[PDB]
Curated annotation (Swiss-Prot):
Effect of gene knockout: Triple mazE-mazF-recA mutant cells no longer undergo an apoptotic-like death upon DNA damage characterized by membrane depolarization.
Taxonomic classification: Bacteria, Pseudomonadati, Pseudomonadota, Gammaproteobacteria, Enterobacterales
Disulfide bonds: none
Subcellular location: Cytoplasm
Record-stated family: Belongs to the RecA family.
Subunit structure: Polymerizes non-specifically on ssDNA to form filaments; filament formation requires ATP or ATP-gamma-S. Interacts with and activates LexA leading to autocatalytic cleavage of LexA, which derepresses the SOS regulon and activates DNA repair. Interacts with the C-terminus of RecB, facilitating loading of RecA onto ssDNA at chi sites. Interaction is decreased by ATP.
Outcome when changing D9A: 10-fold increased survival following 3000 Gy ionizing radiation
Function: Required for homologous recombination and the bypass of mutagenic DNA lesions by the SOS response. Catalyzes ATP-driven homologous pairing and strand exchange of DNA molecules necessary for DNA recombinational repair. Catalyzes the hydrolysis of ATP in the presence of single-stranded DNA, the ATP-dependent uptake of single-stranded DNA by duplex DNA, and the ATP-dependent hybridization of homologous single-stranded DNAs. Mutations in this gene were selected in directed evolution experiments for resistance to intense ionizing radiation (3000 Gy).
Residues of the whole record sequence present: 269 to 331 of 353
Induction entry: Induced by DNA damage, repressed by LexA. Induced in response to low temperature. Sensitive to temperature through changes in the linking number of the DNA. Induced by cold shock (42 to 15 degrees Celsius) (at protein level). 5.1-fold induced by hydroxyurea treatment (at protein level). mRNA levels are repressed in a mazE-mazF-mediated manner.
Listed name of the protein: Protein RecA
Length: 63
């Protein structure tokens, strides 16, 4: 489940994926293009892959 499609769509919209328009980036390592490899680096990122949903889930968790 997780996501990686709405997640990148939530961060790039929130602030988890830093991107210059097409190339995406992450809080540590470029993730890959926005659609060609946005969550691909997030695909093998089980280490932070949770921090994504959380960076967004906690983005307003205690709102």
């Amino acid at each position: 489940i997780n996501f990686y499609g709405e997640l990148v769509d939530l961060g790039v919209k929130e602030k988890l994926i830093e991107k210059a328009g097409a190339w995406y980036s992450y809080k540590g390592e470029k993730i890959g293009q926005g659609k060609a490899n946005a969550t691909a680096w997030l695909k093998d990122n089980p280490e932070t892959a949770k921090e994504i949903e959380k960076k967004v889930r906690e983005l307003l968790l205690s709102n």
